[model samples]
Target chain A: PDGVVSALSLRERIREHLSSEESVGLLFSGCTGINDKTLGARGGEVIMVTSGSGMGKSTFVRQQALQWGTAMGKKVGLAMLEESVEETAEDLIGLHNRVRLRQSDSLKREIIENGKFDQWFDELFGNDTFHLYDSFAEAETDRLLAKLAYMRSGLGCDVIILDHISIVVSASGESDERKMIDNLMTKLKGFAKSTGVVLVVICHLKNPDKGKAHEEGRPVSITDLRGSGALRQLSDTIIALERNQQGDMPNLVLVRILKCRFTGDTGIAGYMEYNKETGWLEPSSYSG
Target chain B: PDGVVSALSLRERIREHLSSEESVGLLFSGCTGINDKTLGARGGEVIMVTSGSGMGKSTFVRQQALQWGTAMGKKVGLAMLEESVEETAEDLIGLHNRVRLRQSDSLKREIIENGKFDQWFDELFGNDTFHLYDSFAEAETDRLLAKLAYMRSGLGCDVIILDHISIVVSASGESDERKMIDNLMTKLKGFAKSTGVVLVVICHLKNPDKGKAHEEGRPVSITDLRGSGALRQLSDTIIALERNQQGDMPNLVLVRILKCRFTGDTGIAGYMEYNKETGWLEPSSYSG
Candidate 1:
């Protein structure tokens, strides 16, 4: 239990990974098909989802959370920076129930009155597997780290999703923003390593209008990431989302592996088609 | 002018470049700092400006037109596809006269009433050097080429600016849009080469919300250009404009070189500070 370790300790760790009945690595499952093998999402890995505004950064994280916690049956914690907890929960509920909450009030009322909404909420959320922190406030990295610790030890979660890192950087009173971001990223990497939990952080990329690959339906690279350059350096895996550049189909989203320390298979890894009914990203029929 | 060029003809071409008193290269006087050297904007070169919506693509072009036509006393012709001739003229007038046309009708009337407006127009627009083709029509590449020929031969213009390429692609009825774009771009490049005039084309990027770069203030690369991959291959130079990504300095703009075939210098080239009064992209006091 002490900080010191030996060959025996290493053997025990390796044996646990080899023999444990638990899921060895986080899998995308139905989210993306071929990428599931190439991208070995594992514990103690910092995976960052980078995209532009309205490019479904939050949706991607929610899908992963659902894949891990609900479908795969693993504990997941989500710390939403911008949206309120209730609003986020409702969105998740809407996704689960296949009812468009924003489309019409009648639809919402019908679901609510039928008691299906409450029943679904109780059945899914009435457990320790999923945790939500949606208090509308500036992101404090220290408190965020502490909260991650709480989610790991207290809730017994194996995965944590931070909605964004920009808010945290903005909220922090630092003149040199780049230095601050670099410092914060290093700290988070350390946190993820020590906790041995799959840490997924959402990062809004600088406008991809600046890159040829991104504009032409080509996969986005880590160079397109906004804020500190440390993001590309510190994060173990970097994934970017790109919508169909041509065509009228707005729902066709491309999943790109900008950078991966695990398998090093970087490029347009796969595609996900947005299902309007379920509000879920299903693996697309087309390949990128 | 046969398929094979003689050594004598090649020598003549080299001598023309060497001995030219007139600015052989189109220079962004104040828009970008270091790019003037890296991108030797010589005549017969096709320069493409690609950016996201609200990223000030038009503003950057206007600044270059002003710098060349007004400041440097060079003949520049603009072929605008979207806006009407009057509206486009008014914007240039506003920039020159230091009057905000969009603010009020009274200001517009005052400018019209005063002799100052006519005098300014006579000084700038009345000259053969500055030409405006603000025809509200779909981009027809053939017609555009014809117009460019007319501008160069009839108007004696040294530089030509095409407002956008998207309209051209959209207007053309083609089953394969990529092939059409590739064809048009090849023709434009040939026109530039034969006519011996600097050609600057504005390209509207696919929605940045589709990718992460536009949101992060990262410089756009040739890859972000929408429609065809040939845009990067054909264009002599590709530049992108990115606004400050921080707390609302709407006036601050970053000029990025996505690709430079000339000197090979690329990336975030420099910064430009927008002035409401003169309607020029002055060198920004702040550095990105």
Candidate 2:
């Protein structure tokens, strides 16, 4: 607050300009969470959810948002990337439909019958406040930042969910995937800090075996994160995804606090149960 | 033979039971196709290809077998676990068709128009020594072992490929998947020792996050080998697969020798060009 601002303060200011990113170094070295004990209470923070391709990184974030909105009553804004506006709407509706079916102890009859689950899914998407952004097939990181800023200013949300962080890496310079991610993560963290909103960014994991080890089933890991080391370092929290290597039932949703800038919870949040039919995390069932 | 017998005699004659193991283990320590140096010049060996769900483990193994049998003039045997025999056959045939199409430089339309590709593929398959085993679907491990032994002896295979080892781990009641793998590997290695047949067990990697430094991605390590440490210790070779995390042509294959007890030449095999369509591997064009 004075002339002797902490290193974090200097880092935040430097991150304001990506080109001037030589200095910020690494931010959020101190694990600080809300309630002095948990990340749940942190008002301004960014948590990255990452896993290998098809590990359902998007599903985890969306379901987390849904859970916060429907179950915890936390006002959440979801930014669905890649999927078109219509498709995003349908996807969320599918989640809702599955939830309703699950609530009623009924199987997904529509999905089981016509196979056009998309139609039924779309129908089930009620007037939930989940915002859909499908204006572009591929978006520049700058464009995404601008939109997220717009939402932050427009809606007083408690949390913001980004469906993913891949195309942003692609749309930028190929050699600059890591830097681009760093810039994006820094921006997200700054946005979270400024707007007092918890930011959730979904990213893909790298293929574990560059070539051979992949033949042996390997579980997803934090290192397999698709983008940069800088982005990973910038994360205030990281929820990793891993499943049984043998493809056993009750897939593991490993939620690790990886970097809890506020909360000193370095241990894993343990395994969470997932229901395919409902497409929701049932509950925390076991520990990793 | 006298010394071998004396040493065996001193060891409580355990070789009798040890040699009765159902699984075969043949270590192909060199990728140079040292078939010329090995006893299996015409003798059969089994390669088990396996990895986590959706990592294309099965596809890689299937392609390797196909490459050896059709292109390199080596007899091949394929064993399927998860998918039906017909489905596996169709998938393999589809791959064969794609390879033919790619090689012919014929457009999709041209290939479809010339319905003869079907007859050609079927005819080629009929003529090739590529055998498929679907007997292990509901059978016990012992039964599968019996079937494999029968194939090695009766089919006159130069190579027997197990499309995967994931199902074995998943189905067994063994609490520790790695231990089960160890026990199984013991049997397999014993088989190889007795039959002088090379065994290639395509295994999925476990703990894919190995050797990740601060979430930075790199080639997966041998630590990802699922179910057992024994394979790494006992196998004559460990080929760790890797690929570029980015690019549409992400099929670049890197084979790392995690363990090579025979020659101790542990190093990364030069990158291989991966054609996903045919699952073929060629020397990388990214030459230094």
Candidate 3:
């Protein structure tokens, strides 16, 4: 090729850049003004949320489903690995009414006598847009994928939430947890991509050492996550929920962003004021 | 030990839990609607922003300084290891005016004759809240930490930005890049913790393989980040910038949250439409 070129030779490439377009997808809202950009829970994206035991990992997932399915009216599928659909339904009613039904003697009796528990449960989560898995004890990747397809067709659910990934691998009989997790994650990611559904997986954090950074009020890092680094590697985002120290505002939940693949939005997405009565967590304007 | 607990014995502990307090620190806003929780840029926190070459790392840092120091009025100290202060100053003006100073022929004449260049230079970045390192060619961990102390005392800077961490390690005389990077990251985290200054370190991604994920329009992962895994393990947050495929959309920048230690806000923070005229990147409201 000759070294010289027409003066206008580069114009086509320059103009092409200025006029290019990005393929935009459907967007959703986060809880209580939590920006959707930070949440990044759009269709076809796989997200992972994890936290220590007694740190509200279950509560967070339940809340997200309620917000998306009940409030925003998005079709959602709930697959509980650790709890049955009935237990989850009862928990949802408890969260809705702001009362611990089983814990309160009088409340439980009043509901039983009036036969109102069934109606409240229906009012809280019953809908054509919401789907729940009957059981996931024996579920593996292929079974889960099949259920996802059924959820999409029979229930029209576009978002699926798996209670905990650990249980998913536990039943697989895979000797190497690391390799198993890595393989499952790859398959799940591909499933989400191919199906064009948002897949949310709840995971548990590795137990923290006493006086470690996490226990001392510092945020947790990806390294602190349990299981293989593959979880973080496979997830489009990783959100961890840490409860405030017992004496330091019992109702305060510190939501930490352990990893994000979308907007580079990381850190304290914000603090949430926990309403013990309703079992609801609402985003608060953080001052400190 | 007899398994016995008085009802009131547990009440006091419950009451203590309801009153506990977490020591919160000063927080700042991120660029546009990029949530602060995701940025997690605060006193005593370390954040890392990385990308491939020509992926807008320098532009991202410059915009951050402008938004935090010039617009939001936080004292900022910048130590660019590769470029001189004067060169950075010039680049700032070019970005401010949205002009490629070296590209346009008549614009240079107009800038020089009208003496607007001088005024624009001063107006763009001159302020007591902003400080620049004379040079960072010889900077090492100890020397950089010393400079941070001096900046704290002499300039009262609360936020410090290091343009590139690779060159810092390159000059450290360590034979193994991984070991050197790991060591430097540990020291940097400690320095931020002790001094209570927000430290932002710039890093680069490992070069992608031909026809790789990035080229295929996938978001970058923490594993894609160059050098040691310590970078992701140590930083409180990681932000990555990716340019649109050249033929697809040249003026669009995709911001990804690779990691966050604060609130688990992750994913594409959002897309920024590049304004070639002002050299400013504006966050666009996502429609999809």
Candidate 4:
């Protein structure tokens, strides 16, 4: 695996990520202001996230993919390009049973007649450890990077999620659209640095300047990504979420770490509120 | 049926629409410039339909809901507020077997390994006569008028399709967005005139003046619908579709006919192309 680039192959790729098991990667497991300013989410990184239009950002990435597939065990995959893989598996068993199952039709028919839908689909996807992307309509980034490289290595998966890449802002056979979202963010930053996984993504911003937006809560700039200024130089970690769904603390939310390249650190990394009868977001100490 | 509004109750409502059978209502079995100026779309009419932003207005309302549900038989109900009731039943059996099965993934994986997807879902929903709109997302205009009056009298459904009502433009407890789309176009023009049902909406316009932008195919005006000016005073036929997705004739389109309140007969009612390998929209004699 030698295609060398110096500083002594970057200190042997930081001692192969400080000796294996991806040395402390993956987080927001209870958002400590985005894990003390980017101290997690490693292996192959991309991150991104964002906010505004209905500011919860798909219930904050379906509550960070139900805490990265059942409380940080990992092996998740999602690919939620705007809904229906049966409403993203009834929104991760309705945010892991805090229940909002697509705003209830009698709580998804009394959780399918009280069998409680096969024990909440065997407690959040019965350890097959997630993996959605059933099919995304009209999304052609070369068959969306060959089904995100078959959900990364033919469904072995690790951390995928995509969710928001703004309606592949049409431009195939391009004659426009920020050169097809900057060639689909440089082929999704070269498929998350050659499939090491941890992709995240979700992007939307760009409609700010001239008073509040990002659905009235404003503030997002990495020049507010809308049609690729190459999602701020092809993603590494951006975060954003800012909420104001019509303020006076409309379920708080303000996360904003804006950009961090493995710890060049960033700003306002705090506050989140959301709740609404447990379709959750939580982690808030509140501040005006 | 007695809440008279005179003209001898509009001559007993035109002799109960010429003695019931809705007197020749429903045609576009092939877009004759919108059924020759909305002459057919009775039983409590609404009709609308617009274009731009990936024109072809949801493939002209899924080819007028597959010629009003299988060649004018009519039970139909659609309500595609932007995709998925299983990709709107695989795009009405991929536009009634013209075969763009949601742009083929090996023809939907060899028609699901040749079971032929339960014989094309028992030949387009087994004569149960198509009724969709199984809960649209966050689309509240009083729960989208109680799911369009339970798809009109709980699924008897004779024509419904609400496809384009621009994402309920977030105005809940309004601070403004054209007074929640003019109170959701006056409660969908009072639930299609008290559920006589023949709704067929799909609006989007606005962003036209100062050169081409309904995704560069331009021209839609009812002062461009966008956030309701009460969809041209509560619709009764508006139809607009004008394609130029980067010109040099990108799938022709053009079918204007501004308004018709039953045969007021407007202009340019002709041409239709779009057939990127059988997603079908045909009817064209070209005059570009």
Candidate 5:
């Protein structure tokens, strides 16, 4: 009692605090299903898709948008840059028909009874609906943010589909593409968090061998992602595309869900199949 | 006789003179866009989508697959590995709905009532006519090719779509990833050429800021393709995603159609719009 230890500090302050199972849970209080190596939380986040020349980054984005928006009942807005706005509509139309045909083998009789597949095709060809960006060459991040804001504020969309990130930054002769991208990513990340919009940015990778590998380019990897390390750091999820063993089926593709910052379930699944005719993504029943 | 220069000699000399273009097509004709920029002369010729991450490689591939298969009446197949296969199906549903919704909006109310939107949606969603492969882990090129062959020999489809390149190559033992992507671009090119199947391979982008001007890795460029450079070199046509301006409903997306080995329309068009609700790509209403 003579001058000694303060009651608050003397008892336990000196001991190190270790993360027990319960302690770990308490530390990640806001995050559900937190453990020594797991995070089971559900929230919309930003994901980036990167690829090189001859890799279909655009299609990857489009498919995600359609799937999430339509199947998941999530409102999705796609920002396209390369093709004409009309081309985008036409392309969707084409994809729609392909999906319909692939899904309609049993409905052949129904198709005939209802006036022919060709007639229906004509009817569906001219119609379209989806918010689109006319020109990506001039697209700036601020403007994109505003649009996304409107979608979130007015339309209440859960996800923002970016056709490609490179197109937005690379078009400018900015001294530092990385800096510009970094700035854009910061804005996007903040916006996504604030607005609860899943910002899916489609990107491209680099051809390290640049054609020296084989008749085609080399493989895809996280390291090949262009621009900055920030891309990997900023993105909540990173997906890279690889060709299936069979070089023939463009429809046979593989997706490596590299990093999932949220779920912490970083695993690769294979034998994915796509039907251009039906415009659908499914597992290869033949192989499965 | 000397001035005439024997016909046989002249023919032989010409053959030798145009050897590269005639044989390799690399000098001026290799993987040339022998037909229109969007559609190839035949189906199954591999079309590689290449660009840096954020270049809209996926969008380009999806649009092409959809347009050619659905709009142009060609059977289309899509193989996407970057996203959930279920999500891909949703996109198809969304695309079809967009078409229907657009038509409903444009046509009279009576016409809309007559159209069975629910039926259409059900048809698109419930049927397995179009096959999709969402999980393709560690699939080799041979397996993929065999699947493609199965689709043709067994499924009886006109076109096959591979959304994008999967892993593309194996990772090192030290690397965290388990599945290895095989390099099958060469065989894919050969298969597409031999089988007359329009093969569309979606590729990934590399870190565009690898060498110079990589300050923190800024924007994406064509050089950032993930695989080797052979993809770009082997491609019949290349399209780069470029957004000229920023913002929603913004005008101008540069469809930088590059390396058209077939038609060679290496031009950049701008000012576009795509209606998300209707799934239509076209010139912006503002542009008009």
Candidate 6:
């Protein structure tokens, strides 16, 4: 408490920070607007995605993981908390081929029958880039954190994606959900920040009373975020998806920057139109 | 740690509190919905009122201010951050008389000419019931706290109304609004707790994207508050106003209890119809 508080101690570390790796980090594939506003997802940062149910929270996060593993040179790890490893692999393989294998019976059969599965699988997962947490469908907080640590140190994963927050807390059977999240989120942030590993976490929004459901393109605020105190404050970059599934342009999704701790530039990042045929959400300028 | 903790030690203190004073505390007039849900606002509780611009936040707060003074006989301190002492006095006086004196030039002329002004002023201000913060409308934390402390101790004010929290942050000249708010809120919470005073503070809600404008009656979420993190978590009770100024029932306003630390019974507190003739928000059963 009596120690002198000055910048002299931090001068050398600050210099090291300036010349460090992420001068500009990994960018998003579909929503380019986010990159321009928030710059990019950097190491030692936690990027969280929040949206309404069925508003593509999983899809958006999966896409980011895919881009990091397949598109970018960074090694990526996926911890799909709710789903199985086999299904996660299938989704990624299907996503790479622009096919919704999880949704389609015919295409899943066709891909394996035509042997395109093997060809695509090797190109995507053959390298040491893609890693999955091959564990049982259990969400013990410490165990999950341990797995994440392994993915970072042992597997050399530059980025890690934790599928969803609610299930993890609920599955663990915590008495107070909010307090559990705050603790869990605290650990997640510290893990990422300490290891200099980029984190992309998924979150769900609470239901709205006055406006239409998030499925109907209700604008999401930081406050709507479940466990908002932890999720909003701890995360370095926060992105929200808005979509009116019943609207005329059913495929269009709006990406809103809820918070950008790095740049402090928050607002609409851009619009992405999901292609049913390609099974990809591609960035668009809303030319019309 | 293994010893059994019993309520035996606290039994006498509990008994003293049970029969001492304010068994039910002060009740809110006009909107009776809140009293039923939260029981009543007790001493040493911080009650927050937040809403969008032009959505009757001031009206709801002013009514409570009026009720505590004339109806409940609590020594209340009015700290209207953005306005002069005269306006605050006029507002309360006008609200008590069911006449918006500030808005109506004719009423001001009529009241003074008919000698009603002196009569009403003395009637309302005659007793030691109401006091105003006679500062230069400054937002300095130390100075403001001193004023509040003086209001609580010297003036014996039971309830203190701090009219807009946003001004405190901006006027304090802080770079990080959230951090500034967090620090200010910590002090506010501690002050209320330590001084054992009831604080009714007003806050502004942030804009929403997917929903209609708050002015259009879009529901106010806890996240919508400007400094939601500190404000939501710190305040004992939070009340929000929702009104669609252009809707069919333009005069109708919904009072939603965003949070209740005392009772934890949160939801639609009640609806009040703005009576243009009386300039008072009257609780409506929504019979129409």
For each prediction in turn, the share of the native Cα contacts (below 8 Å between chains A and B) that it retains comes to 0.00, 0.01, 0.00, 0.00, 0.00, 0.01
Query: Which 10-residue window of candidate 6 chain B scores lowest in summed lDDT?
Result: B167-176
Error of 6 at A188 (Å): 0.4
After superposition on all C-alphas, the RMSD of every candidate to the true structure, in Å, is: 23.2, 22.7, 22.0, 22.5, 27.5, 17.8
lDDT string, candidate 1, A1-288, tens digits: 788877776986787767753433777655554355354677888988876444556677877787677767888877776544554565565666665453334555655568665566655565546676644444466766777777776667888888767655234345645676777789889988888888899887654344454433555567767666897888988888887433356678877777778777676677787776676777767743
Error of 6 at B53 (Å): 13
Candidate number of the best lDDT: 6
**Which pairs clash in model 4?**
A26-A41, B164-B202
Candidate 2 vs candidate 4, DockQ winner = 2
- State TM-scores per candidate: 0.49, 0.44, 0.49, 0.34, 0.43, 0.53
Q: Candidate 2 at residue B94, lDDT?
A: 50
- Least accurate stretch of 10 residues (summed lDDT) in model 5 chain A? A23-32
Off by over 4 Å in 1: A1-23, A32-39, A169-173, A208-218, B1-288
Q: Indicate the docking level reached by candidate 6.
A: incorrect
TM-score of chain B of each: 0.84, 0.70, 0.81, 0.32, 0.65, 0.92
* DockQ, each predicted model: 0.01, 0.01, 0.02, 0.01, 0.02, 0.02
How much is the lDDT of residue B167 in candidate 2? 43
For model 2, residues A155-177, the per-residue Cα lDDT tens digits are 55667778777667345445635
Q: TM-score of predicted model 1?
A: 0.49
Q: CAPRI verdict on model 2?
A: incorrect
Put down candidate 5 lDDT per residue, A1-288, tens digits, no spaces: 478877777545544433221211111111122222233212346777654433444555665555454434555565655443443443443354454331122443444456554454444322222455444234557766777667666656656677666655323545766787677878788888777666778776653533332113245666767667777887887765555322467556555566768666664433355654555555543332
Residues B1-288, candidate 3, lDDT per residue (tens digit)?
Answer: 978988888997878766742223323233443454364465777878876544556677777776677666778887765544544555555666777553343565666568775566556655656677664233556667677666755567788888767654234345656786787888889888888788988887654443443422456788888776988898988888876443367557777777777777777776677666666676665533
* Candidate 2 chain A TM-score vs. reference chain A: 0.70
Regions more than 4 Å wrong, model 3: A1-33, A36-40, A136-138, A170-175, A208-216, B1-288
RMSD of 3: 22.0
Better of 3 and 5 by TM-score: 3
Candidate 5 CAPRI classification by DockQ: incorrect
What is candidate 1's DockQ? Answer: 0.01
